[PDB]
Design a protein around this motif. Structure first.
Motif, PDB file in Angstrom:
ATOM      1  N   UNK A  65     -12.287  36.760  -1.405  1.00 56.56           N
ATOM      2  CA  UNK A  65     -13.649  37.256  -0.998  1.00 56.56           C
ATOM      3  C   UNK A  65     -14.163  36.464   0.227  1.00 56.56           C
ATOM      4  N   UNK A  66     -13.406  36.533   1.292  1.00 51.14           N
ATOM      5  CA  UNK A  66     -13.847  35.980   2.570  1.00 51.14           C
ATOM      6  C   UNK A  66     -15.076  36.707   3.207  1.00 51.14           C
ATOM      7  N   UNK A  67     -16.031  35.919   3.728  1.00 49.46           N
ATOM      8  CA  UNK A  67     -17.190  36.411   4.526  1.00 49.46           C
ATOM      9  C   UNK A  67     -17.315  35.585   5.813  1.00 49.46           C
ATOM     10  N   UNK A  68     -17.541  36.215   6.968  1.00 45.17           N
ATOM     11  CA  UNK A  68     -17.679  35.478   8.218  1.00 45.17           C
ATOM     12  C   UNK A  68     -18.959  34.642   8.175  1.00 45.17           C
ATOM     13  N   UNK A  69     -18.871  33.414   8.660  1.00 42.76           N
ATOM     14  CA  UNK A  69     -20.067  32.610   9.043  1.00 42.76           C
ATOM     15  C   UNK A  69     -20.196  32.583  10.566  1.00 42.76           C
ATOM     16  N   UNK A  70     -21.410  32.377  11.070  1.00 42.90           N
ATOM     17  CA  UNK A  70     -21.652  32.367  12.513  1.00 42.90           C
ATOM     18  C   UNK A  70     -21.319  31.025  13.211  1.00 42.90           C
TER      19      UNK A  70
ATOM     20  N   UNK B  37     -16.797  37.201  29.664  1.00 42.06           N
ATOM     21  CA  UNK B  37     -15.639  37.593  28.845  1.00 42.06           C
ATOM     22  C   UNK B  37     -15.673  37.092  27.386  1.00 42.06           C
ATOM     23  N   UNK B  38     -16.490  36.066  27.096  1.00 45.98           N
ATOM     24  CA  UNK B  38     -16.558  35.405  25.789  1.00 45.98           C
ATOM     25  C   UNK B  38     -17.994  35.372  25.223  1.00 45.98           C
ATOM     26  N   UNK B  39     -18.117  35.774  23.960  1.00 46.85           N
ATOM     27  CA  UNK B  39     -19.368  35.743  23.187  1.00 46.85           C
ATOM     28  C   UNK B  39     -19.161  34.700  22.123  1.00 46.85           C
ATOM     29  N   UNK B  40     -19.894  33.589  22.251  1.00 44.20           N
ATOM     30  CA  UNK B  40     -19.651  32.407  21.419  1.00 44.20           C
ATOM     31  C   UNK B  40     -20.267  32.547  20.017  1.00 44.20           C
ATOM     32  N   UNK B  41     -19.407  32.562  18.990  1.00 42.18           N
ATOM     33  CA  UNK B  41     -19.750  32.575  17.569  1.00 42.18           C
ATOM     34  C   UNK B  41     -18.428  32.677  16.797  1.00 42.18           C
ATOM     35  N   UNK B  42     -18.391  32.103  15.589  1.00 46.56           N
ATOM     36  CA  UNK B  42     -17.258  32.291  14.679  1.00 46.56           C
ATOM     37  C   UNK B  42     -17.359  33.598  13.885  1.00 46.56           C
ATOM     38  N   UNK B  43     -18.453  34.357  14.049  1.00 43.53           N
ATOM     39  CA  UNK B  43     -18.544  35.654  13.369  1.00 43.53           C
ATOM     40  C   UNK B  43     -17.830  36.669  14.274  1.00 43.53           C
ATOM     41  N   UNK B  44     -16.544  36.842  14.033  1.00 43.95           N
ATOM     42  CA  UNK B  44     -15.744  37.753  14.858  1.00 43.95           C
ATOM     43  C   UNK B  44     -16.033  39.272  14.671  1.00 43.95           C
ATOM     44  N   UNK B  45     -16.962  39.634  13.782  1.00 41.46           N
ATOM     45  CA  UNK B  45     -17.537  40.981  13.731  1.00 41.46           C
ATOM     46  C   UNK B  45     -18.530  41.211  14.883  1.00 41.46           C
ATOM     47  N   UNK B  46     -19.008  40.125  15.473  1.00 39.66           N
ATOM     48  CA  UNK B  46     -19.989  40.166  16.546  1.00 39.66           C
ATOM     49  C   UNK B  46     -19.478  39.614  17.862  1.00 39.66           C
ATOM     50  N   UNK B  47     -18.678  38.555  17.838  1.00 45.63           N
ATOM     51  CA  UNK B  47     -18.262  37.829  19.039  1.00 45.63           C
ATOM     52  C   UNK B  47     -16.783  37.482  18.955  1.00 45.63           C
TER      53      UNK B  47
ATOM     54  N   UNK C 111      -7.445  38.517  12.012  1.00 48.69           N
ATOM     55  CA  UNK C 111      -6.812  39.805  11.687  1.00 48.69           C
ATOM     56  C   UNK C 111      -7.660  40.804  10.878  1.00 48.69           C
ATOM     57  N   UNK C 112      -9.003  40.691  10.846  1.00 47.37           N
ATOM     58  CA  UNK C 112      -9.819  41.653  10.132  1.00 47.37           C
ATOM     59  C   UNK C 112     -10.365  42.719  11.063  1.00 47.37           C
ATOM     60  N   UNK C 113     -10.383  42.506  12.370  1.00 45.23           N
ATOM     61  CA  UNK C 113     -11.052  43.479  13.244  1.00 45.23           C
ATOM     62  C   UNK C 113     -10.109  44.681  13.499  1.00 45.23           C
ATOM     63  N   UNK C 114     -10.552  45.856  13.081  1.00 44.45           N
ATOM     64  CA  UNK C 114      -9.734  47.107  13.046  1.00 44.45           C
ATOM     65  C   UNK C 114      -8.515  46.986  12.114  1.00 44.45           C
ATOM     66  N   UNK C 115      -8.719  46.262  11.012  1.00 47.01           N
ATOM     67  CA  UNK C 115      -7.673  46.129  10.010  1.00 47.01           C
ATOM     68  C   UNK C 115      -7.527  47.456   9.274  1.00 47.01           C
ATOM     69  N   UNK C 116      -6.369  47.658   8.654  1.00 52.18           N
ATOM     70  CA  UNK C 116      -6.080  48.960   7.996  1.00 52.18           C
ATOM     71  C   UNK C 116      -6.517  49.040   6.530  1.00 52.18           C
ATOM     72  N   UNK C 117      -6.994  47.937   5.958  1.00 53.56           N
ATOM     73  CA  UNK C 117      -7.590  47.930   4.596  1.00 53.56           C
ATOM     74  C   UNK C 117      -9.096  48.096   4.727  1.00 53.56           C
ATOM     75  N   UNK C 118      -9.753  48.536   3.667  1.00 50.15           N
ATOM     76  CA  UNK C 118     -11.213  48.715   3.648  1.00 50.15           C
ATOM     77  C   UNK C 118     -11.803  47.440   3.019  1.00 50.15           C
ATOM     78  N   UNK C 119     -12.223  46.499   3.863  1.00 52.95           N
ATOM     79  CA  UNK C 119     -12.748  45.177   3.460  1.00 52.95           C
ATOM     80  C   UNK C 119     -14.156  44.986   4.022  1.00 52.95           C
ATOM     81  N   UNK C 120     -15.038  44.319   3.272  1.00 51.15           N
ATOM     82  CA  UNK C 120     -16.382  43.968   3.769  1.00 51.15           C
ATOM     83  C   UNK C 120     -16.375  42.433   3.942  1.00 51.15           C
ATOM     84  N   UNK C 121     -16.499  41.964   5.168  1.00 51.38           N
ATOM     85  CA  UNK C 121     -16.476  40.532   5.474  1.00 51.38           C
ATOM     86  C   UNK C 121     -17.842  40.061   6.054  1.00 51.38           C
TER      87      UNK C 121
END
Length: 283
Positions: free
Chosen positions: A1-6, A234-244, A273-283
């Motif tokens: 149950x991984x969730x991104x932090x910013x 070219x770079x948006x600084x954050x560890x939330x890779x859903x946003x940056x 490896x979650x961005x445009x991944x082929x499984x249906x995951x909520x991170x």
């Protein structure tokens, strides 16, 4: 149950993750012949590896004076951390490859050429990745499922892989090493920007998670490079890779030693490896 932090913070794996796990991934020693002659690598397969399924793949480079056996030796034990994290659901199952820049004409700087021509086709013809073929078109089509990282001279390798292999690789993990290409940090950042421009890729299609220790000598040249990169569009600084797409983890008190660096991989690899991944995951 991984969730991104910013702004993810340094956290070592518990001490029990350094001991062998009963759900152990298989490690296979391979030998191949490429542009730098006959060489070996190790392939970590996750526990329950099924070759009828497709796996994300992370290639991970050793440091100066080390070799393709170092990362899974008693001096590092990365497989134990991988095994535990996959078993506890912190890390989605993946293949991890540990190659070498030793041998023939090979240097940490020039390894990307052998990587492209020999290592990817060799490994990904035999093991089940998202690559449907290992032609250049097949490798480039599966780039969102491929990553590269490394420590010290292997961090330098990672930066040269990024600038020459954006077509093949979307996730980058340079650990305690800077990009030796230019006479200022702005030359470095500009070279990375020019490579991105040439690739045609959007900001949602490449990701850089860099790390080092606050007491690691690599900090002195890495930090100015990171600061020059943050200023690029070219770079948006954050560890939330859903946003940056760009982050720099600095571990307080950590020195230039795999004893610490293995924990950076524990912290960062679950972000890939979650961005445009082929499984249906909520991170």
């Amino acid at each position: 149950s991984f969730k991104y932090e910013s702004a993810v913070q340094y956290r070592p794996a518990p001490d029990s993750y350094l001991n062998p796990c009963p759900q152990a991934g298989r490690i296979v020693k391979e030998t191949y012949t490429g542009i730098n002659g006959t060489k070996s690598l190790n392939v970590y397969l996750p526990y329950g590896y099924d070759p009828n399924k497709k796996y994300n793949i992370f290639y991970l480079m050793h440091g100066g004076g080390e070799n393709e056996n170092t990362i899974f030796s008693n001096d590092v034990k990365l497989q134990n951390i991988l095994d535990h994290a996959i078993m506890n659901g912190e890390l989605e199952p993946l293949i991890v490859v540990t190659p070498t820049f030793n041998g023939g004409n090979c240097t940490a700087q020039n390894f990307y050429q052998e990587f492209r021509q020999n290592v990817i086709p060799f490994v990904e013809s035999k093991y089940s990745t998202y690559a449907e073929s290992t032609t250049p078109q097949g490798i480039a089509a599966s780039r969102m499922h491929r990553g590269f990282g490394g420590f010290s001279m292997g961090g330098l390798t990672t930066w040269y892989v990024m600038v020459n292999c954006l077509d093949y690789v979307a996730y980058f993990m340079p650990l305690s090493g800077d990009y030796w290409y230019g006479n200022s940090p702005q030359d470095k950042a500009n070279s990375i920007a020019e490579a991105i421009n040439r690739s045609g890729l959007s900001k949602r299609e490449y990701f850089v998670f860099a790390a080092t220790g606050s007491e690691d000598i690599a900090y002195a040249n890495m930090n100015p490079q990171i600061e020059a990169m943050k200023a690029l569009p070219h770079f948006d600084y954050t560890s939330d890779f859903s946003k940056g797409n760009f982050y720099f983890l600095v571990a307080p008190g950590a020195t230039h030693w795999w004893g610490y660096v293995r924990h950076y991989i524990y912290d960062a690899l679950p972000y890939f490896f979650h961005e445009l991944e082929h499984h249906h995951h909520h991170h």
